[PDB]
Amino acid sequence: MEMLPNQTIYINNLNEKIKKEELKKSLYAIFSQFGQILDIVALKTLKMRGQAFVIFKEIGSASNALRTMQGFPFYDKPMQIAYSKSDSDIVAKIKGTFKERPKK
């Protein structure tokens, strides 16, 4: 398994205690050392406490950050990361579950 370049990466095993602000600072503190971030998206709601997205300078820099930080103990949990546009948001869009009701 090897990732493919995309300007955005998706993170899905953050320690859920981490606030949006703490995620933002920790990404700026460490993940920018591995490619320079351009933008960050997480939320204080539980649905984005273990999960985040982050947009990088260039697709190669995004790839470098992703692969280097994959499995890294960024907190008391090893990170799990993928490149965007091959991640749960697009999977939910093609399933419809992004916006469809579970039943009518």
Side-chain angles (χ1 to χ4, degrees):
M1 186 178 72
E2 289 298 344
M3 311 89 186
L4 278 68
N6 185 270
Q7 198 174 357
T8 315
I9 71 176
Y10 169 61
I11 296 167
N12 67 85
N13 196 43
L14 284 163
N15 185 314
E16 55 266 65
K17 80 189 181 178
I18 300 305
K19 296 176 182 179
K20 183 186 177 181
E21 174 172 90
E22 294 178 304
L23 165 288
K24 190 180 68 176
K25 285 192 69 177
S26 46
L27 277 177
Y28 184 75
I30 314 183
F31 268 68
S32 290
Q33 314 302 338
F34 296 110
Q36 188 54 67
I37 288 175
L38 180 61
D39 186 36
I40 297 174
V41 183
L43 224 302
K44 191 170 180 285
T45 43
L46 184 148
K47 63 174 64 178
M48 289 297 296
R49 267 176 168 271
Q51 313 82 348
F53 290 89
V54 42
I55 303 67
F56 262 83
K57 177 175 56 57
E58 280 167 277
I59 69 181
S61 318
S63 306
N64 182 76
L66 196 184
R67 193 180 190 276
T68 307
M69 298 304 293
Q70 185 72 293
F72 186 83
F74 185 60
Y75 286 104
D76 191 51
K77 288 188 176 181
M79 289 289 261
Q80 294 289 269
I81 324 186
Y83 58 102
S84 305
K85 312 190 188 184
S86 287
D87 74 272
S88 311
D89 178 77
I90 68 154
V91 174
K93 282 177 169 64
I94 66 177
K95 286 181 178 183
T97 44
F98 174 69
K99 62 89 182 181
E100 288 290 278
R101 298 180 179 177
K103 58 180 180 180
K104 62 182 181 180

